[PDB]
């Protein structure tokens, strides 16, 4: 194969992008320059996972018995209870909306990270060799795009709950007085509480991005640099270790989302 | 890597799946579990009344 | 040497001048030589070792207590 | 010349210091978790809940620094 | 420079990874799901006996 | 020209140091919190609120090094 | 040329160190505040008062080093 | 040209800092684990299980820095 | 000439190290002060007297370094 | 020529930091092992077993860093 | 000339590390002193005595450095 | 000649950082050995044997870094 | 010539690092000395005797490095 | 030439890092020695014997680095 390994690593990172002007499946030899070039792979795989989650849970939500559940139903209700408990212990306001949001985040992010586990070249091989498609990378969470889209959604919700439950006067008094609560230092508090507010979503998005992107990059490197026989011994540990990463980074995102909203309303 | 329109694309897909799950999945499942919990615990009510 | 008393609520088990003791204190085995700083600990059941002055060793069995 | 390599060195600083700060801060917090757990085993699910609760604050800024180090390596360079 | 041979190396690692998960990771999950079915079954059976 | 790039080598220092400062600063603070929570396991929801009060003061000067670091990288260049 | 750039790198080093100093100093002080409070909840308002008092001293010399970083970038530039 | 060795020196810094962070963070966590293991020997399998969960967090950022070092050393240079 | 910008970098590092040294030193002292206050709160005025006495001895070398750094920045540069 | 020379400086930082990280991490862990062993002599072989288990996790990244230090100094040399 | 730059840099780094050393060295000692006073409130004048006895040793090398720093900055430059 | 002098600096870093690593790692370990001896003067030999075992692990990488420091400084020069 | 610049810089680093080392090493030893004293003053003169016996060793390499630092700065100029 | 002052900086590096390593290593070990003495103030000779036994080890690598610093300082530099 004519691929230099030094550039095989690069082509992987390049997205499949649709130009809103040309509607054209770009390739890694030359990247065009505009904002409007949706990363096709991320949207399609993201909605495929999120709709698969919604359909499977809706089908049990439609059937669900108060008798002895089916084994599959038992696993679904297990995770429903797992989330409900975490919400109930962490959140002590009423709002109905907190629990489903947390469940969607936990399962959808878990599935997006799980997307990385499948061998890096296998789907790109199917796309290029059989289906003739020009590019592919399969993991949504590896992108900044999805992780900031989610984190900014949570930031909006923080503003919504904080003005709902205590409103502009309480909210501004907290931002202006706290930390010091000293009227002599309001401008300092204004900086410190603004940057503390903005730090929460940006950190939320970048933690997940950085973990899943470097995990992918490791799989790319192992596939690219080493001789294939030697690749199994190093690849098995990283895949096992990655199972723990994918699970904890999903769990932590859900947990902090709940904590930030509980802190905002109370 | 760089910023992109995809951020808005995902934001629309996210809010749709948020509302769909919120209404359709969550009350139905929690109601099913709590209806089981109710019928099990009211079985203890049978013993409380019978003993008294 | 130092004066050691071993005393139960009912009776006295030992008294005398001692060179050292080795003791199975609760959070791991302990040894007391003279001048040892003020200390207070519970102890586990087992044989305490006494070394009486002029080196004459004897054992005592304790079912517990506080040192 | 001077475009590429300084950005690689800046990223190497950002990502190295972010690993130092994260790994020591998480190690300290996890140690105090394990000390409490060994004392209070019934609490282990309670304590690990509080551990993750506090832990999420520890790496937030190191992850800022890693995300920007990835942007400078991949996006700019 | 075999994309295939590197795909062979991937296939070896991926089957090894599946065999590990099936022996070591899925059975702990299935054991917890079965413990959940057990707790539900015993809860319902004891509730019926109290109704009797 | 290096006038566009040595700013980014400076920014890697600015926030990279602040990241170890904040992460270990939070990591120590969370460590003492978890021990008290094992000693006073009923009191934890009080403790967690007091933790957030003092944690809220840890942010500020790391947060300036982050904000000026970003501002140097993208506002100044 | 790079005469003006090194002033930004000096500001970066000065503010990055001041961020470490303040963040660790408040991290330890706040930890000992929390353990004291966990042992004595009636004391919590008194402890928090003395905590804010000592934190003023902890902050003052970081504050001047950050103000000199701001003066270098804004005022001397 | 002399770009190669600067990329190597950057990767060297980044891996060195990542090994310091990993080794100290796990070393601390393992030390508190061994204290717990000495107190509660029947618990050591349970504590060992809980110890791996947090050890994965502690290593997560070091593995990022190792991966980026390998990219710069092997792939860019 | 080059001359002035190295003097700015020298003052910057001198006061950055002064800020770390004084902030952490006063953090440690303040932590043991707060644990002592929680142990014997009727002794807080005597502990304040002693804390301020010791705080005067800690800050002497930091404030000397602050003095030189401020002289070099305003007067020499 | 300097292409050859700076690669020794890179190996020097890699190996120096890997030695610091390894020796500190194992020294802390070993200290907690000796404290447990002195308290619980019958536990000594069981604790020794766990000590080796956790020591194997501590040393992984230092050994990656020296493995690269040896690859750099002998291979690119 | 070029002699001025490195003389001022030497004296800055020399005295910064002196601030780091002396402020931490007395911070630690003052902490264990204030623990002692809060454990043992009568001994304070005797504690203060022996604290001053050891404080005089901690300053010995920092005072040399600060003395030699003023020499470099004002007697040589 | 331009080559060998820089190699003295690379040896100076390898051998200096290996000195820090071994010195502090063994200093901490031996301190916990001394605690164990002070609790159990009767077990002072047995603990010394365990100390020597773990001390042999702690200095392994410092011994690597000094052995190669000697190779580079004397033999490759 | 230039040689003065690096000789003053080497004196500033060598004595600044010896100053940190001696300051913290004595501050740690003194902290344990003052704790042991505050626990039981009757011992204070015996502990003082053994403290100075130990303190003579901590100062060995610091004062050697000061001797070389003064020789370099004044005599080699 | 540039060689001479560069080699004196390389010696100053090895002497600074060896002074730090020795002073912290011995200060930590000696602190544990003084607490062990304060515990059993009649067993001081036995503990001092074991203290010197382990001190010879913690000094061994620092004394190599000082000897080599001496070698270059009076031979090649």
Author numbering:
A (entry chain a): 4 to 269
B (entry chain X), E (entry chain Y): 1 to 52
C (entry chain H): 3 to 69
D (entry chain P), F (entry chain I), G (entry chain Q), H (entry chain O), I (entry chain L), J (entry chain N), ...: 3 to 79
Question: Would you copy out the relevant sentences from the publication that reported this structure?
Answer:
A key component in the generation of cellular metabolic energy is the F1Fo ATP synthase, a biological rotary motor that converts the proton motive force (pmf) to adenosine tri-phosphate (ATP) in both oxidative phosphorylation and photophosphorylation. The enzyme is comprised of two rotary motors, termed F1 and Fo, that are coupled together by two stalks: a central “rotor” stalk and a peripheral “stator” stalk. The Fo motor spans the membrane and converts the potential energy from the pmf into mechanical rotation of the central rotor that, in turn, drives conformational changes in the catalytic F1 motor subunits to generate ATP from ADP and inorganic phosphate (Pi). Here we have used cryo-Electron Microscopy (cryo-EM) on detergent-solubilized cysteine free E. coli ATP synthase13 to probe its structure and understand its rotational dynamics and coupling.
The three major rotational states identified previously (termed States: “State 1”, “State 2”, and “State 3”, assigned to describe the enzyme operating in an ATP hydrolysis direction), in which the central stalk is rotated by ~120° relative to peripheral stalk, were also obtained in this study with resolutions of 2.9, 3.1, and 3.0 Å, respectively. Hence, masked classification focused on the Fo stator was used on each of the main states to reveal sub-states describing movements of the complex along with increased detail in the Fo region. The focused classifications of States 2 and 3 also revealed sub-states, however these showed only torsional flexing similar to that seen in Sub-states 1 B-E, and hence no movement of the c-ring was observed within sub-states of States 2 and 3. Thus, across our maps of E. coli ATP synthase, the rotor (consisting of the subunits γεc10) was observed in four discrete rotational positions relative to the Fo stator: one in each of States 2 and 3, and two in State 1. By contrast, in States 2 and 3 the spring is close to its relaxed energy state in the observed single Fo rotary states, and the adjacent Fo rotary states are inaccessible because thermal excitation is insufficient to stretch the spring through the required 1/10 of a revolution.
